[PDB]
Structure 1
Amino acid sequence: ISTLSNGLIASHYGVSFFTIQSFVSSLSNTSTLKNMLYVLSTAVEFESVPLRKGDRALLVKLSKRLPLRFPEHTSSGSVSFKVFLLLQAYFSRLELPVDFQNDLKDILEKVVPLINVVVDILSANGYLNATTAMDLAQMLIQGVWDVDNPLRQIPHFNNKILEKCKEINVETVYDIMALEDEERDEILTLTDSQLAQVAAFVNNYPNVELTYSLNNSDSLISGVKQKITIQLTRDVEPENLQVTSEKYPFDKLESWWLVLGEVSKKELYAIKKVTLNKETQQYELEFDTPTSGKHNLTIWCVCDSYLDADKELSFEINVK
């Protein structure tokens, strides 16, 4: 299978060779988020997580309230059953038994290297569903479903506050920071300690601007390695890139994937993992020029640590 491309591997995260061999065999260009969550749950790295007598029976009961079911003709007798379900309880923000809370902390300690390896395997194959693993990576940091309200990321945003936001058509983090003092204090019925934690989050939440330059557009030759420059600007230089997350109990640094690809062909042409630590920065990507004709290409700038802060740009090329 490893006729894989070295230049299409963005990170240096590591796990056992056993797990890498298993992941490579288990993932394809059609893998879904649910498939990837299952595959991740099978990592031998989780064998250090406790599995007690009675846990499976307790997990079966818990599973009633979770949206995704464990694969049908697969034994529920291993730690993978626990990992698959507790990670969903994490996304759903279910209150857990103290003992399952302990196991969840142990699980979360191992997830970042594992999800990054999933991204790297898919991207090394040129598979655009690497972006599906990126979606899952975001959920693992903020502890929120990709189908739930993205405002849930902000500390102390309970159901009452979410409904007050809906009533005035406030939907994004940027809508929150745009609010006038009196309307802001109307919705944010929170204590002093709580308000400071909202403030910490909103000030650190990224707002990036994506541009590019492609030298000699509409004069490209098929097959030749082509360079493209990607620039990303922030309003001011960040004082630190330490991620604010209520739910992820370990230190995390803000990182981004820069992705070039073509949606209609489900193909990833190039990828790069970057830190946007400056007011402005640019990066050079290299790809093989596709066949003769018109192609619609997209650049994505995807954050590993927050939801709804990603940026994308589409453009047309003509290969002679």
Structure 2
Amino acid sequence: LIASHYGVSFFTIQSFVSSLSNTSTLKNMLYVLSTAVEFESVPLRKGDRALLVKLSKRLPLRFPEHTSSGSVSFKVFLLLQAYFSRLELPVDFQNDLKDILEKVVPLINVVVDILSANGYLNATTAMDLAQMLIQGVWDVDNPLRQIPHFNNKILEKCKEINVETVYDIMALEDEERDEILTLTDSQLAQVAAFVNNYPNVELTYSLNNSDSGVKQKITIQLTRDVEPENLQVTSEKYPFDKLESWWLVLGEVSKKELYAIKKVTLNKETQQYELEFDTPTSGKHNLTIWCVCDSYLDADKELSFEINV
């Protein structure tokens, strides 16, 4: 499907800015996201609150206690968690969840932008949430769970053999693979679609080596084993079409400062980009570069290095 276009309202940007901070957690961000005025187009029916209160007993993150649960925010916060946890929902909530998911992508990117434009490194946590919204799983979930039809049985027979990542599955011989993949050809088709476009990239970079109040430009390159036929994303749970994108981030963990960020698409077997940042406070800094995908979990890459001021 195609998600109806829209630009997050300035009113929502103001609200997000006002609510987010350098210490916001994954939970805080989910709550903030749930407050977007944009969600007021989502139905709130008589009887829904009572159903949602029950549902909340089965979900990990609590809605802000002293906040009214008679808002659509309560519904959005909880159904999104039900989505990540893959809980069964009655049809009306299923319909509502779909309406909610149609609007989340623009909103989570605004969260990422706000935190990053402020140089807050927790921008990476917003990115984790972004991935969760696309695959319908938690960041702490078994990474294989995002593969279509990978039920608990299969996951268990991946554990015994020590198969942990999508790459491991493919590194497998062919009847160790079949033992793992006990599914119908129809199901295997959707498994295939997923593995076919699941990314595997390699990250590298370069400098100029010497400085200070002025801008240093680092050069980051991303390598794929093959230019992907395309970047259409495969998601069993996200009902709309999505194009694969990545954030290139340079930061300093110790200070949890985000030097600079850049959104790119890795549509080639090899790419190169350049980020300009300011040149830090003397002494030296232990810096890291993250290449984070916005559409899959467990495919990110990073590498750290030392500037000697």
Report the TM-score, using the length of structure 1 for normalisation.
Answer: 0.94
Q: CA deviation at 1:226?
A: 0.7
Residue 294 of structure 1, aligned match among 284, 288, 301: 284
Q: Give me the whole-angstrom Cα distance separating, in 2, the residues matched to 1:282 and 1:117.
A: 25
Q: Give me the whole-angstrom Cα distance separating, in 1, the residues matched to 2:53 and 2:45.
A: 14
Q: Deviations over 1:267-317 (max 9, x none)?
A: 000000000001111001001100111210000000000000000010011
- Most deviating of 230-239 and 109-118: 230-239
Q: Deviations over 1:89-123 (max 9, x none)?
A: 00000110000000000000000000000000000
Q: CA deviation at 1:148?
A: 1.3
Residue 31 of structure 1, aligned match among 20, 24, 28: 24
Does the 8 A contact of 2:16 with 2:111 survive in 1? Answer: yes
For 1:85, what is the secondary structure of its paired residue? helix
Cα distance change of structure 1 residues 212 and 12 upon mapping to structure 2, 3 Å threshold: farther
Q: What stretches of structure 1 move > 6 A for 4+ residues in a row?
A: 8-13
Q: Give me the whole-angstrom Cα distance separating, in 2, the residues matched to 1:177 and 1:284.
A: 33
Q: Give me the whole-angstrom Cα distance separating, in 2, the residues matched to 1:10 and 1:165.
A: 35
For 2:21, what is the secondary structure of its paired residue? coil
Q: CA deviation at 1:216?
A: 2.0
Q: Give me the whole-angstrom Cα distance separating, in 1, the residues matched to 2:18 and 2:93.
A: 30
Q: Give me the whole-angstrom Cα distance separating, in 2, the residues matched to 1:96 and 1:60.
A: 14
Cα distance change of structure 1 residues 137 and 88 upon mapping to structure 2, 3 Å threshold: same
For 1:65, what is the secondary structure of its paired residue? coil
Q: CA deviation at 1:182?
A: 1.1
Cα distance change of structure 1 residues 10 and 96 upon mapping to structure 2, 3 Å threshold: closer
Does the 8 A contact of 2:197 with 2:234 survive in 1? Answer: yes
Q: Deviations over 1:142-187 (max 9, x none)?
A: 0001111110010110000000001011111110011111111111
Does the 8 A contact of 2:4 with 2:102 survive in 1? Answer: no
Cα distance change of structure 1 residues 12 and 89 upon mapping to structure 2, 3 Å threshold: closer
Aligned to 2:194: 201
Cα distance change of structure 1 residues 50 and 13 upon mapping to structure 2, 3 Å threshold: closer
Cα distance change of structure 1 residues 293 and 159 upon mapping to structure 2, 3 Å threshold: same
The count of residues paired between Structure 1 and Structure 2 equals: 309
Q: Deviations over 1:210-245 (max 9, x none)?
A: 000011257xxx221111100001111111100000
Does the 8 A contact of 2:207 with 2:217 survive in 1? Answer: yes
Cα distance change of structure 1 residues 9 and 122 upon mapping to structure 2, 3 Å threshold: farther
For 2:291, what is the secondary structure of its paired residue? strand
Q: CA deviation at 1:62?
A: 1.2
Q: CA deviation at 1:196?
A: 1.5
Cα distance change of structure 1 residues 87 and 12 upon mapping to structure 2, 3 Å threshold: closer
For 1:103, what is the secondary structure of its paired residue? helix
Cα distance change of structure 1 residues 298 and 28 upon mapping to structure 2, 3 Å threshold: same
Q: CA deviation at 1:53?
A: 0.8
- Counterparts of 1:97-108 in structure 2, within 5 Å, are 97-108=90-101
Q: CA deviation at 1:37?
A: 0.3
Q: CA deviation at 1:13?
A: 8.1
Cα distance change of structure 1 residues 227 and 12 upon mapping to structure 2, 3 Å threshold: farther
Cα distance change of structure 1 residues 112 and 118 upon mapping to structure 2, 3 Å threshold: same
Report the TM-score, using the length of structure 2 for normalisation.
Answer: 0.97
Q: CA deviation at 1:14?
A: 3.1
Cα distance change of structure 1 residues 13 and 229 upon mapping to structure 2, 3 Å threshold: farther
RMSD: 2.9
Does the 8 A contact of 2:3 with 2:240 survive in 1? Answer: no
Q: Give me the whole-angstrom Cα distance separating, in 1, the residues matched to 2:5 and 2:213.
A: 28
Aligned to 2:308: 318
Q: CA deviation at 1:9?
A: 25
Does the 8 A contact of 2:135 with 2:146 survive in 1? Answer: yes
Does the 8 A contact of 2:116 with 2:261 survive in 1? Answer: yes
Cα distance change of structure 1 residues 137 and 256 upon mapping to structure 2, 3 Å threshold: same
Does the 8 A contact of 2:2 with 2:241 survive in 1? Answer: no
Q: Give me the whole-angstrom Cα distance separating, in 2, the residues matched to 1:9 and 1:92.
A: 24
> Aligned pair 1:282/2:275, yes or no?
no
Structure 2 regions of 5+ residues with no counterpart?
A: none
- Most deviating of 264-273 and 60-69: 60-69
Q: CA deviation at 1:205?
A: 0.3
Cα distance change of structure 1 residues 10 and 207 upon mapping to structure 2, 3 Å threshold: farther
Q: Deviations over 1:6-65 (max 9, x none)?
A: xx9999983111101111110100000000000000000000000001100011111111
Cα distance change of structure 1 residues 9 and 231 upon mapping to structure 2, 3 Å threshold: farther
> Aligned pair 1:257/2:256, yes or no?
no
